[PDB]
A paper describes a structure:
Class X myosin has been found to be localized at the tips of filopodia, which are plasma membrane protrusions containing bundled actin that are necessary for cellular processes such as cell adhesion, migration, angiogenesis and the formation of cell–cell contacts. Myosin motors move along actin filaments via a series of conformational changes in the motor domain that are coupled with the sequential release of MgATP hydrolysis products, Pi and MgADP. These conformational changes in the motor domain are amplified by the myosin lever arm, which is comprized of the C-terminal subdomain of the motor domain (known as the converter) and an extended alpha helix length that varies with the myosin class12.
We thus crystallized the motor domain of myosin X in the pre-powerstroke state (with ADP vanadate bound) at 1.8 Å resolution, as well as that of the MD2IQ of myosin X at 3.1 Å resolution. Comparison of these PPS structures show that while the subdomains of the motor are totally conserved in position among the myosin PPS structures obtained to date, the myosin X converter is rotated compared with that of myosin Vc and other myosins. This is not due to a conformational change within the converter as found in myosin VI27. Our MD2IQ pre-powerstoke structure indicates this could occur without steric hindrance between the CaM and the rest of the motor.
Numbering used by the authors:
A (entry chain A): 3 to 786
B (entry chain G): 83 to 125
C (entry chain C): 2 to 146
The structure:
């Protein structure tokens, strides 16, 4: 295990393999210097084979596909990503899986339309790894495979999921046109232009600044693109998941509310600003509480311009844009209502109330009464009871959230209406969820976000490892099982009967229950569950050992957030609005009033945030389960939003918990492509033209595959199917394309020579009949 | 009648008019060259 | 090898038809059209390789002697009753001898060369089996002689 000075080695320093150089080897002491700047010293006698191993040649300036790596460990995988990151190569393959390291800066030429064109005309692996190559492969599968496709993008908050989604959408829009026919009038009226313009609208209404991302997605998005048999986008559908409606009324320190509020205030012209009684963001409780602020407007002004343009493309009328502006202004003024106690809650100053009532189309005394009093009718006279200041604040904030959430729902309806089209052939679905987030203080919002991330990780494992190896077993392939860290038990803790959501929902249905009684139940039931953490000192918290790390949740607020109560008094008030836009939003809205039995312990219970979210996720995963998936793994290089800063500890953590090592193992050894024997033979028959084939189909498949790999290692025959590596399938698809094209040339040349010969023989015949007739007609006329 | 068949296919016009000079360019270069003397009479 | 006087005369006929200019020169674009008119079915590629030889300068013209050479060259190949038949057979699938008008139209428009739809729809609607419901290739191959 002795290595001379200057030797490149992997030093196992119990946790990982470090890329290192032998600094010195004298007096029975060996000193190693890592590429990360660490110096490790040992007695030479203590060094054994791994402790130390030689580093393969150069590894090599990087490898494009990590299945090509010689040394397979976390250290090796990370070093490959690092070397590539250093030269602005942010993309690396693991078979057809894509790793993307956020550069946090523009990389010249990387996403230009000239690059998109280049990727559209090549096969996977012919050019450097790129998100465009994945989008292209996915698109090509609509004619190579019999099913719908989906692209699932994973990663922590700020990893690059949203940017990845926009790049895939841009690429597919471009490829859709290709598939004919152009005109700038077409291209500006375009369904693909409308699909692209959905992003600035949705980001303004659904994204906000958080500690991990200045443009954090505060809702989940599933974009389905319907593609016709001819290859063009017919239309689409966008599905939104759990918008963080509480952000409207409160934010953690240093965060911002939704971008749209700041864009509105920065972007509106003086006249409209004055019409809606709007001033700077500092003047609004719903925008000033976080202390951020910290910006001299300008970026918000550009976002407003971008939104306005997108809304015009989306066919929002100028009045609809003004109506949305009026509602947002109404919400802002609503937040400035202050209360005092004078038996009991009373509105202190009339200005904010008057402005909000005017903008919302409500009578100011009716609004004051609804926020400060509760109504009851008894056989059959009204009994008005005062609310206290906390109840009045909760009413004001519930009203602000209801308005925003309904407006967001309407905006999504409008986008969907614009992009509506036929579903005649197949679809490509793209999933952009809110990423994993672990804040200093986590509340119910983080619990739901992290649950969705956990659910997606389970789908990734089910498809990459579980179902994959089960198929190899059923087909009887020569296969050594690859182990992988399964998060199924964490989802069981969250989802099962008596699980976290079950207990949260059960406590929510009991009016007497508090967050403290809930925590007692959570601790009692799950203290011994491997994935649950009962804190030793933190009396208000419970922890969950998520795939991406242990997260501690403060219970304070869970019941009220899960119940998501909205007073019938407020719903009735909104239906009084003289502003049709507001009335239309609340016209048929279902009641969410606080229930008080009697003896209504009946199995149904009112739907909670948790129950509605669990259902939506389940519905989504069921849709995804029937599509063929492509996986993109986004990696955050650092926690400072910095370019050219690869934090090896930060990166290694993500590679470890996401199971990148095991993923590389199964994509290197496995056979991701498979077709029944006859299907394989019928597809690749063109490639067997020059072969002496046996009578049996298994033999026919073997004949072709043996030419590509005589070792029988890149392909295998199962019970019913031909199994082959993605690289071999790509090699076969490239050759099939070349022969098919050559055959089209042979027939294109033969038919053109038929058409021209037909008409040349026709003209030669038509003339000889007129020449013979004229030779006769003139011979008679000569005789007269 | 055995003429209208060979003149309905002798034009790209598709309006019953076989652009004069083109008919002259058809004869002499053809399968049965007409010494242009016959061509001077078909004007 | 050698071209009989009757053969040379038959070619000068087809040449002179496209030589409207009366200068003894046809355009490069017309070389395809003329060769095709006389039997020979060169590929877009074969045609380019012929042009690059004759017309290096970029004049865009072909005299009768250089055309005659292109003809006698393509005449040497010879391929083949089962060669067009083999190219059509890649467009299957089930060995029934049937290719649909849809993919055949795709071959004619996108692939090979981009050509006029009004001429290719007549090349299908008239030159097709079952009258409407799809085309037989082995029959079409036989008809293409
Ligand atoms: N491909 C990329 N190239 C350059 N900057 C990027 C890229 N991906 C992400 N970023 C930057 O990092 C931010 C976080 O990425 P984003 O997609 O918004 O996060 P998320 O994974 O949370 O959806 C971006 O808004 C952008 O500023
Ligand atoms: O920052 V995120 O879009 O992952 O929530
Ligand atoms: Mg995002």
């Amino acid at each position: 295990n002795f290595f001379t000075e200057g030797t490149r080695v992997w030093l196992r320093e119990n946790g990982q393999h470090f890329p290192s150089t032998v600094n010195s080897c004298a007096e029975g002491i060996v000193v190693f210097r890592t590429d990360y700047g660490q110096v490790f010293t040992y007695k030479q006698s203590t060094i054994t084979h791994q402790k130390v191993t030689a580093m393969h040649p150069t590894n090599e300036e990087g490898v494009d596909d990590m299945a090509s790596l010689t040394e397979l460990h976390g250290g090796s995988i990370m070093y490959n990503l690092f070397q590539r990151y250093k030269r602005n190569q942010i993309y690396t393959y693991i078979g057809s899986i894509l790793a993307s390291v956020n550069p946090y800066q523009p990389i010249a030429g990387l996403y230009e339309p000239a690059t998109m064109e280049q990727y559209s005309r090549r096969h996977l692996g012919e050019l450097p790894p790129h998100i465009f190559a994945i989008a292209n492969e996915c698109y090509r599968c609509l004619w190579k495979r019999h099913d719908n496709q989906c692209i699932l993008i994973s990663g922590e908050s700020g990893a690059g999921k949203t940017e990845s989604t926009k790049l895939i959408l841009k690429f597919l829009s471009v490829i859709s046109q290709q598939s004919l026919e152009l005109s700038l009038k077409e291209k500006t009226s375009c369904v693909e232009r409308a699909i692209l313009e959905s992003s600035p609208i949705m980001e303004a209404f659904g994204n906000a600044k958080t500690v991990y991302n200045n443009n954090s997605s505060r809702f989940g998005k599933f974009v389905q693109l319907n593609i016709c048999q001819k290859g063009n986008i017919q239309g689409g559908r966008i599905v939104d998941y759990l918008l963080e409606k509480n952000r409207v009324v409160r934010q953690n320190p240093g965060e911002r509310n939704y971008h749209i509020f700041y864009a509105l205030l920065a972007g509106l012209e003086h006249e409209e600003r004055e019409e809606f009684y709007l001033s700077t963001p500092e003047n609004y409780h719903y925008l000033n509480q976080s202390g951020c602020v910290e910006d001299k407007t300008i970026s918000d002004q550009e976002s407003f311009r971008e939104v306005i343009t997108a809304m015009d493309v989306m066919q929002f009328s100028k009045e609809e844009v003004r109506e949305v502006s009026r509602l947002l202004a109404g919400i802002l003024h609503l937040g400035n209502i202050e209360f005092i106690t004078a038996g009991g809650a009373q509105v202190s100053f009339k200005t904010a109330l008057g402005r909000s009532a005017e903008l919302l189309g409500l009578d100011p005394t009716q609004l004051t009464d609804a926020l400060t009093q509760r109504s009851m009718f008894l056989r059959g006279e009204e009994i008005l009871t005062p609310l206290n200041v906390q109840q009045a604040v909760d009413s004001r904030d519930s009203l602000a959230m209801a308005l925003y959430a309904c407006c967001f729902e309407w905006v999504i309806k409008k986008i969907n209406s614009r992009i509506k089209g036929n579903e005649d052939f197949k679809s490509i679905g793209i999933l952009d969820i809110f990423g994993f987030e672990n804040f200093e203080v986590n509340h119910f919002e983080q619990f739901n976000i992290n649950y969705a991330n956990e659910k997606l990780q389970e789908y990734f494992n089910k498809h990459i490892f579980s179902l994959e190896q089960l198929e190899y077993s059923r087909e009887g392939l020569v296969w050594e099982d690859i182990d992988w860290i399964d998060n199924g038990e964490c989802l069981d803790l969250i989802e099962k009967k008596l699980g976290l959501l079950a207990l949260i929902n059960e406590e929510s249905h009991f009016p007497q229950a508090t967050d403290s009684t809930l925590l007692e139940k959570l601790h009692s039931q799950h203290a011994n569950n491997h994935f649950y953490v009962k804190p030793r000192v933190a009396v208000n918290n419970f922890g969950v050992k998520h795939y991406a790390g242990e997260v501690q949740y403060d219970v304070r607020g869970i019941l009220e957030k899960n119940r998501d109560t909205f007073r019938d008094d407020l719903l009735n008030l909104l239906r009084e609005s003289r502003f049709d836009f507001i009335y239309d939003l609340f016209e048929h809205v279902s009641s969410r009033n606080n229930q008080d039995t009697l003896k209504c312990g009946s199995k149904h219970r009112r739907p909670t945030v948790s129950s509605q979210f669990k259902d939506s996720l389940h519905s989504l995963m069921a849709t995804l389960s029937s599509s063929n998936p492509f996986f993109v793994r986004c990696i955050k290089p650092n926690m400072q939003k910095m370019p050219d800063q690869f934090d090896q500890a930060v990166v290694l953590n993500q590679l470890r918990y996401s199971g990148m090592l095991e993923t590389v193992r199964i994509r290197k050894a496995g056979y991701a492509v498979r077709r029944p024997f006859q299907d394989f033979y019928k597809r690749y028959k063109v490639l067997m033209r020059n072969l002496a084939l046996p009578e049996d189909v298994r033999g026919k498949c073997t004949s072709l595959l043996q030419l590509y790999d005589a070792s029988n290692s890149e392909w295998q025959l199962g019970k019913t199917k031909v199994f082959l590596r993605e690289s071999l399938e790509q090699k076969l698809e490239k050759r099939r394309e070349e022969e098919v094209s050559h055959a089209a040339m042979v027939i294109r040349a033969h038919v053109l020579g038929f058409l021209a010969r037909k008409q040349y023989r026709k003209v030669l015949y038509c003339v000889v009949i007129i020449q013979k007739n004229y030779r006769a007609f003139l011979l008679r006329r000569r005789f007269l | 009648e055995e003429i209208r068949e060979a003149f309905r296919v002798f034009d790209k016009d598709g309006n019953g008019y076989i652009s004069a000079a083109e008919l002259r360019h058809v004869m002499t270069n053809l399968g049965e060259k007409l010494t242009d003397e016959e061509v001077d009479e078909m004007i | 090898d050698q071209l009989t006087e009757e053969q040379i005369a038959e070619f000068k006929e087809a040449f002179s038809l496209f030589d409207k200019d009366g200068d003894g020169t046809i355009t490069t674009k017309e070389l395809g059209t003329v060769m095709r008119s006389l039997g020979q079915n060169p590929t877009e590629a074969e045609l380019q390789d012929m042009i690059n030889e004759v017309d290096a300068d970029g004049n865009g013209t072909i005299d009768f002697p250089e055309f005659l050479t292109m003809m006698a060259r393509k005449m040497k190949d010879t391929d083949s009753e089962e060669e067009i038949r083999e190219a059509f057979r890649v467009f299957d699938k089930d060995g029934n001898g049937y290719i649909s008008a849809a993919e055949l139209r795709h071959v004619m428009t996108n692939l090979g060369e981009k050509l006029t739809d009004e001429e290719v729809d007549e090349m299908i609607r008239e030159a097709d089996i079952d009258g409407d419901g799809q085309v037989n290739y082995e029959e079409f191959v036989q008809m293409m002689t």
